[PDB]
Amino acid sequence: KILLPEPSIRSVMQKYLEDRGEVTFEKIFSQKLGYLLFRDFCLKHLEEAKPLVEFYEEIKKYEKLETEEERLVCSREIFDTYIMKELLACSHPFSKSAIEHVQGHLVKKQVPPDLFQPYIEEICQNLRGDVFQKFIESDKFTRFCQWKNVELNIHLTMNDFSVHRIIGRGGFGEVYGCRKADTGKMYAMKCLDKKRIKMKQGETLALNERIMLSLVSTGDCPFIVCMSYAFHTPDKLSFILDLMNGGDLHYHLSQHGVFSEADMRFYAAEIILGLEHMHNRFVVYRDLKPANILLDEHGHVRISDLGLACDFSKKKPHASVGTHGYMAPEVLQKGVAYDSSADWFSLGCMLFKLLRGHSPFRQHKTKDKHEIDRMTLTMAVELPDSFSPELRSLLEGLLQRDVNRRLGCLGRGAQEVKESPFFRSLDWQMVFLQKYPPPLIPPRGEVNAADAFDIKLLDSDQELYRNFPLTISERWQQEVAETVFDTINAETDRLEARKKTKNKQLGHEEDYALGKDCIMHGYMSKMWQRRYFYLFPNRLEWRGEGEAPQSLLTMEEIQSVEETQIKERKCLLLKIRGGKQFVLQCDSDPELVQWKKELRDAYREAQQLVQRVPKMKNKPR
Amino acid sequence: SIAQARKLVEQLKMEANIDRIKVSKAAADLMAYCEAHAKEDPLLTPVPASENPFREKKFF
Amino acid sequence: SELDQLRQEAEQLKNQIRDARKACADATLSQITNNIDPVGRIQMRTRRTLRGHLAKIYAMHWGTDSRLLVSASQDGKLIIWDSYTTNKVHAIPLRSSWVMTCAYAPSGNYVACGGLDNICSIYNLKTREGNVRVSRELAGHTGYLSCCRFLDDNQIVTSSGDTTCALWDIETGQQTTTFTGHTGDVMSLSLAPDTRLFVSGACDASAKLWDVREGMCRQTFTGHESDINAICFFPNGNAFATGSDDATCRLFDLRADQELMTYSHDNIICGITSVSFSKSGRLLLAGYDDFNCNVWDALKADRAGVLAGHDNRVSCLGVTDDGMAVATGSWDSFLKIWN
Numbered sequence A: 001k002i003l004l005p006e007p008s009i010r011s012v013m014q015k016y017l018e019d020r021g022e023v024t025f026e027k028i029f030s031q032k033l034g035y036l037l038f039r040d041f042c043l044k045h046l047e048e049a050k051p052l053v054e055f056y057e058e059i060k061k062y063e064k065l066e067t068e069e070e071r072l073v074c075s076r077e078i079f080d081t082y083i084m085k086e087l088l089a090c091s092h093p094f095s096k097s098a099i100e101h102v103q104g105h106l107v108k109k110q111v112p113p114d115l116f117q118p119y120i121e122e123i124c125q126n127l128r129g130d131v132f133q134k135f136i137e138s139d140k141f142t143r144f145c146q147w148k149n150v151e152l153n154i155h156l157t158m159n160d161f162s163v164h165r166i167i168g169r170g171g172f173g174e175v176y177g178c179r180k181a182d183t184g185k186m187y188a189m190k191c192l193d194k195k196r197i198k199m200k201q202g203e204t205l206a207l208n209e210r211i212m213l214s215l216v217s218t219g220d221c222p223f224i225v226c227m228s229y230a231f232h233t234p235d236k237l238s239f240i241l242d243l244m245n246g247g248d249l250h251y252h253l254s255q256h257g258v259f260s261e262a263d264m265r266f267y268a269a270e271i272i273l274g275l276e277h278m279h280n281r282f283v284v285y286r287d288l289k290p291a292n293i294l295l296d297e298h299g300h301v302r303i304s305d306l307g308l309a310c311d312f313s314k315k316k317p318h319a320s321v322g323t324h325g326y327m328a329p330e331v332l333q334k335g336v337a338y339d340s341s342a343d344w345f346s347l348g349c350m351l352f353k354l355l356r357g358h359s360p361f362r363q364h365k366t367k368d369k370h371e372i373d374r375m376t377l378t379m380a381v382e383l384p385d386s387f388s389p390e391l392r393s394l395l396e397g398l399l400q401r402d403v404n405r406r407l408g409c410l411g412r413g414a415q416e417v418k419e420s421p422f423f424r425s426l427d428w429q430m431v432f433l434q435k436y437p438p439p440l441i442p443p444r445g446e447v448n449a450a451d452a453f454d455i456k457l458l459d460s461d462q463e464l465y466r467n468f469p470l471t472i473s474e475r476w477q478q479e480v481a482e483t484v485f486d487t488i489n490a491e492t493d494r495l496e497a498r499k500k501t502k503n504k505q506l507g508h509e510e511d512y513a514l515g516k517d518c519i520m521h522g523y524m525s526k527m528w529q530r531r532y533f534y535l536f537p538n539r540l541e542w543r544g545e546g547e548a549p550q551s552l553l554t555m556e557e558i559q560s561v562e563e564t565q566i567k568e569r570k571c572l573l574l575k576i577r578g579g580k581q582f583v584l585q586c587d588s589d590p591e592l593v594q595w596k597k598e599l600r601d602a603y604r605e606a607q608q609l610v611q612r613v614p615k616m617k618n619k620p621r
Numbered sequence B: 001s002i003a004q005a006r007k008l009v010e011q012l013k014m015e016a017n018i019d020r021i022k023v024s025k026a027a028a029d030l031m032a033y034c035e036a037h038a039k040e041d042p043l044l045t046p047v048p049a050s051e052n053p054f055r056e057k058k059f060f
Numbered sequence C: 001s002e003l004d005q006l007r008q009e010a011e012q013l014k015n016q017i018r019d020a021r022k023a024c025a026d027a028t029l030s031q032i033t034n035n036i037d038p039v040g041r042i043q044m045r046t047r048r049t050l051r052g053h054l055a056k057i058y059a060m061h062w063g064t065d066s067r068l069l070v071s072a073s074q075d076g077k078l079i080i081w082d083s084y085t086t087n088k089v090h091a092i093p094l095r096s097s098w099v100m101t102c103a104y105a106p107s108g109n110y111v112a113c114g115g116l117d118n119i120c121s122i123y124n125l126k127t128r129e130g131n132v133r134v135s136r137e138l139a140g141h142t143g144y145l146s147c148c149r150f151l152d153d154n155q156i157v158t159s160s161g162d163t164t165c166a167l168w169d170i171e172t173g174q175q176t177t178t179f180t181g182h183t184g185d186v187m188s189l190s191l192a193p194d195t196r197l198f199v200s201g202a203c204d205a206s207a208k209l210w211d212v213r214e215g216m217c218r219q220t221f222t223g224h225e226s227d228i229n230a231i232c233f234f235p236n237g238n239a240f241a242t243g244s245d246d247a248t249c250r251l252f253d254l255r256a257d258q259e260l261m262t263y264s265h266d267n268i269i270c271g272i273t274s275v276s277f278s279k280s281g282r283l284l285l286a287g288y289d290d291f292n293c294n295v296w297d298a299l300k301a302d303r304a305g306v307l308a309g310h311d312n313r314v315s316c317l318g319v320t321d322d323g324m325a326v327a328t329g330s331w332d333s334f335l336k337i338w339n
């Protein structure tokens, strides 16, 4: 279970954040937990702010409204309440141009999602500044810090998860279904073996996957298996991915046999939007095949395993990489560059396999890969008569041999594929919202769903994996927001009000840092004895609970502040004048960073300052 | 700093025009002060312990 | 070259003053007092130790009741002690850590203190409300505050590392009079008994005598080889003592306008941090960076005694008005009261 720090951690985190300029409105408002505590402050504690956030929230809902009729109705409801009422109340802090943008658009019954966008900007304008500053003055920013501390001190292991039944097995590792103990959120845990990676020389595969995952796992993309965490153990690499316990299309093509035009079209759409996501972020998947598409409980699909993908914002690749039946002509040509076009030919190939049960160039079960490669290059595959003419113009468009003639290559990307006559029935909004009914819902608790067709390691090996652990901020903040956030904010609230009534009754109310020139103050421990610290321009005091500080060190007497390691943990090391040593242990990675900073800033500062004062410097003895 | 070394002179004029007295007298006046008041100086002429806050005085 | 003829009139005028004084130099105090009996063996002992401050003490000051004293420490705090019991009357945490000086008003009512904050801050110890509150802050100086002293509840003289002293009006918060003259950081000041005059020592190695009202430097005393750190009026108002890094103290007479005496010793190598006379003026107590205070026979220059108490620098000291005791204050964080 998640236990938050105490409100005293503000003093350290506020500084930590200010150093990185993350105490601005843009950086806090645009975070999930930042937004939520900010919203709360404006709704409950500042009367000027509530109608601006209320209005904000109302537009955000309007943006999600599916049908044009819903918009016309909601838009006039937003107009008459937050524009007209505010205006008649002499209480509408917004521009003319803003008013006349909406009024112009409404009177013509134009209600696009973006209608209200000038007000998003002008609401933001009136929230940043005076309102934001009071928000920083409040308990909620205190609470934001309490939260953001817990985030910057995430260290996972196996014991933070509860591992359940297997859900996949490939060449290098095997995926499991798990629960993250502190939130009770269900995930998949990929567990790649280090010993195998070294044995098959796929350090480049494992490595590339994490860089690629990180580049895709923001935004909430329904159609790719995105990552929330990555981490290490003594002999494993573990990604924490989106749970998918429904097997893969290669296994399902085995049980179900081929699909119809209608059924493949479903899988088509959901895959197309997956590709569109990665191509906006300059990633080509390459290894698109049915074995790589996965299914949830409901039968919706995601793209999986990004080893063979690579970034193309910087340098367009040229090697042939990916499975042989589904590669494009320019991918197989050596010394020839390619961009997102590799996938649209792959799509076409995979899409055929769903319909006809083989790759369109693998003619007669033939393992001869260099025959599948010469048919790809010379043959424009013949398409059966069964296939609709709407299906043909798609598969022909997608399987043009020239990049200059292929669908999705002529400049508008996925949009050229979406516009095909094959997809003319589809509303792509409803694909994205996962509203279309899936064909194959997987059988409940099925054995062998998403399987594949399949010496020691020094320090020198694990130096590859030392910049592996990651935590995606957007995702952790989401998980929290949708599970425990509310009840923990209410638990921690009751808890901090009972210690208030206690510390008032025992006398200790007045706070020692105020009205003074204290730089920073927080809990640390010294050898381990846990005390509260206060750091002034010329000294580091500290106290036990229920007294005032009766102890200190001076900034004069500190000689250097170094970072040393004690009992498998990172610590500060103050060498003191006259050879004596001071060691401090910290409750979190950000605290340790900032103490170390602020102590060094302080002692260099002081020593410099004192040197220039005859009455305070040392003299000859 | 031509304005400034002229201000130093007008100052030194003030320091020079003063009625001085012979060291012999000065010293004579100091020494005579010290003996004048030496019985009123507890660091030289101790007081009783009972009248001394820092030895034996009880009531305050 | 108007700057050459004014740089030659200076060296010439200087020699006119040297001559006027060498002509008053008919005897030496040492000669004049050669006959009077020596003071004896002064064996003062620690009668109270005062525990409280958490780091170096820089400064202290007796209240006129010869009982309460205020003390100013590196720990960012003023303590006001009742010497008679060792009780604390007030502990005053400060807005600035960098404090260097403190002062107790003759009345009893306020204390003052200052430092690298560059501001003399007046505190009220008897508010209507019954709490110790900053009643004024005196900004004006462009350098650190090194010493200050009250004339009354409405007036205070300060000295700063900006090379200047200044008489303030605590109500208006402005400098009534500014005392420019020193060519280097002013470390200490002392008021004459009648408070119409005061003297200042500075890191230019000179002390200066000022007029409170007319606001100019009347007389200037040289001879020290090195920074003058403290300075102290002799009780009749006619002479003052000094204390320097050069390992000496000196006695200067006002009317004879020159150095009467030098207190020193070849064993003594550390510098002086503070000076103070006993009640009659016969004893001259001096505080040193060798962790001792030395008692000097002011008349005869003999070293009459040593107070050897602290384990770091004696930084400050002072004798009580009624003459009954002397206090020392060190970098070891302790004050001690002796007689």
Ligand SMILES: O=C(NCc1ccn[nH]1)c1cc([C@@H]2CCNC[C@H]2COc2ccc3c(c2)OCO3)ccc1F
Pocket: A167, A168, A169, A170, A171, A172, A173, A174, A175, A188, A191, A192, A202, A205, A206, A209, A225, A241, A242, A243, A244, A245, A248, A291, A292, A293, A294, A304, A305, A306, A307, A450, A451, A452
């Ligand atoms: O070795 C595997 N992939 C190759 C590789 C090397 C380095 N990065 N990627 C591998 C492959 C699979 C299967 C092999 C069959 N195709 C699907 C694939 C992925 O399986 C899953 C199964 C469930 C999942 C999931 C992926 O992500 C969320 O939930 C399972 C475990 C594996 F370790």
Ligand SMILES: *N[C@@H](CS)C(=O)OC
Pocket: B059, B060
């Ligand atoms: N001790 C009392 C008078 S008996 C007092 O007022 O303080 C010296």
Ligand SMILES: [Mg+2]
Pocket: A317, A318, A319, A320, A330, A331, A332, A333, A334, A335, A336, A337, A338
């Ligand atoms: Mg190529």
